[PDB]
Amino acid sequence: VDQATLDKLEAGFKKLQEASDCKSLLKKHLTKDVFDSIKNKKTGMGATLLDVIQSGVENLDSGVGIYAPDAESYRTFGPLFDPIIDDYHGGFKLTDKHPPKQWGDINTLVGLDPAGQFIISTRVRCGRSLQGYPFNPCLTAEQYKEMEEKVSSTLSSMEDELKGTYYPLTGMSKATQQQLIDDHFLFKEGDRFLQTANACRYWPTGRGIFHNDAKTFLVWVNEEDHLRIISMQKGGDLKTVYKRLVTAVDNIESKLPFSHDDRFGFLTFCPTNLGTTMRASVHIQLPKLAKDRKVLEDIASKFNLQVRGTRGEHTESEGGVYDISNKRRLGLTEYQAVREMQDGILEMIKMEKAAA
Template sequence: MDQIDSTDLAVLEAEYKKFKAVKSRSLLKKYLTQDVFDKLKHRVTASGATLYDCIKSGLANPDSSIGVYAPDAESYTLFHELYDPIIDEYHGGFSPKEYHPGINFGTADALGDLNEWGNYVVSTRVRCARSIEGYPFNPLMTSEHYAELEQDVENALDMLDDDLAGYYRSLNRITIQEQDELIAGHLLFKRGDRFLEAADACRFWPDGRGIFLNSDNTLVIWVNEEDHLRIISMQEGGDLAQVYDRFVRAVTALGNRLPFSFSQRLGFLSFCPTNLGTAIRASVHIRLPNLGKDKRILEDAADQFNLQVRGTAGEHSEAKDYTFDISNRRRLGLTEIECLQEMYDGVKEIIRLEKSMDKGNSRSRKNSTY
C-alpha cells in the first residue's frame, strides 16, 4: 500500500480540522471520528486515491446527507472503516459481516401496471448504475480513460438489437440546443451539481460523455455522467412490468459484452455508496394533489416501504404541481426483483392513500352547507 505524500497530507489535515468545527448532519461527520481519520489519512489506493478524494465533496458541502464518494473500486476496502458504518446506516442495516445476495432479476410478470387503480402515475423508469472493471471512477479518470471507455461502450451498444437497438451520440457532437431539448424531456443529464463538482466528478467535461437512445426513447444509456454507465428503461404511464422487462434485457445484453465491476460483499460497485448492491433505482413520477398538501402522510407511507420522495428534477429539487419522484431507497442486501417489488407495493399503497383522501374530500363537500 502506497503512502500519501507530505503536501497532500497537510492539505487533508487542514481541511479536516476546518470540517470538525462546522455543524453538519452528514454521515461523514458522524463516522469520520479523529481515530478513524488518523487510521486512514496515510493510505493510498493503487489508482492513487487518498482519503481526501473520498471525502472532499462532504468537506465542501456540510449540508450533504452522506458526504462521501468512492474515487475507485479499491476505496471501499482500503477505507472500509469509514465506508462500512455509512453503508450500514444508509441501507437500513448491512453490517461488515454481511454479503449482498446473488443476482436475481426474477420475472416482470410479478409486477403490473400502477395505473390500474387510477391515472396517477405520469411516467415510470427503472435504471441502474454500472462501472467497468479496469477503470477508476470519475475523480481519477484521465482524458485517455474517458476516450477508451467511451469507445468500449459504444462498441457494445452497437450490438443491441430489436427494440433495444438505437444510436449513440457523444456530447461533443450534440449542439447546446439539442442538449437542452433532451434535458427538458428528462432524457439527458446535466453537468454535475455542486456535490459532484466538489468530488471532482466532472473533469474534462464533456469529453467521453454521451447518450444512447433506442428508436422510441424508451431505452436511454448515459455514458460517464456520475457513473461509467447509467442504463435506463422508461416510458409514459405506469406499466412497471413492461419497463422492467426492457431494463433486464438491456442490462443482460450489455453485461455479456462489458466486464461490470462487482464485489462479493457489496454487489455492483458505483461512485456513490447509496448505489451499491443491485444499483437499481425504480421510480415513478406521480401526481398526488392530496398527499402533496400533507407531506407528512406521504413521507410516513414512503418510509414504511423504504421509499424516497423528491422532486421530479432530481435530487435536491422541489415538487411542482404536486408531482413527485418516488423510488426505492434500498439497493443493497436484497435482490433486483425484491427492489422492484418493494417499490411496486409502496407506490400501490400511496395511490390507495391518495384515493382515500379523494373520497374524504368528496364526503366533506357533500356534507357542507351553502
C-alpha cells in the same frame, strides 16, 4: 500521504464538527477515531481520504458526502464506508455479502395506477463499471475516450426494440442537449456534488447518451458511472419497463465485462448505488399526501422509499410532481428492490385515496 493533504483533512474534519446543522452521513459517521484510523492511508492509484470526503466537506448539504475514487477505496477506507453503507441501505453488517443477481419473476409485477390519475411516468435504472477502468476521479481524458468507444461500439449491436443511436455530448447542440435534459432523458450537466469529487474532469469529453428512437431505452456514458442503463416511459406499466431493462442488461452483460465484488455486488462510484445499483422510480402526484414535502418524505421513508424533485435529486417538486423510488440497492435482490417501489407506491396511492 503528503503533508498538504493532511492539513486539508484536519481542516475538513473541523469544518464538519462546526457545521451544527449539517445532516450528512459523512458527518454522522466520521468520528475522530474513524478519522484518525484512515487519514494517513493511500490506495495504489493514490486516492486519499480527501478524495473520498472532499465532496461532503465542501457541500455540507450532502446527504451522504463520500465517493470511492477506485475500488480499493471501499476497503482501504472501510472504517468510513462500512458504517455509511450499513446506514444508507437499511442494514448491512461487516460480515454481510450482497446476494447473487436475481431479477425475479417479472410476471408478478403489476400496473401501478390503472386509472391514471396519480402516476405520470415510470423508470428503472442500473449502473455498471467497466472492468479495467477506475472511477471518475482516477480517469484520464484518454480513458474517457477509450471507454466511450468501447461502450458505443458495443451498443451498436443492439437489435429490435433496443436498437438505437449513440449521441456524443461533444458536438451536441445546446438546444438538443437542453431538451433531452428537460424531457428527463439526459443526465444534467454541472452537478456540484460530482464536480467537487473531481468526477467531471475533461467534460464533456467521453460523455454521451445512447437511446432507441422511442427513447424508452437509454444508456448514459461517463456521467457519475461508466454506464447507466435506463428503461422508462409514460404511464405506470412497471412490468414492461422492468422487463425491457432486464433484456437490455442481460444482453450488454454478455458483451462487456463489468466490475463485480463478492461483498458489494456491482461496484459503483457512490456507495448508495452499490449492489443491485437499481433505482426504480415514478413521477407521481399525491396532492393530499404531498401538502408538505416533509410529510410526504416521512410517509415514504417507512416504505423504504426516497423522495426527489421533478428534475432529479437536489431539486424541488414542480407542479406537484415528485420522483419517488426505492432507497436501498445493496443487501437485497433486484427483484426485492423493484418490489419495494411497487409495493410502496401502491399503498401510498391507497393512502392518498383515503386521505380527507
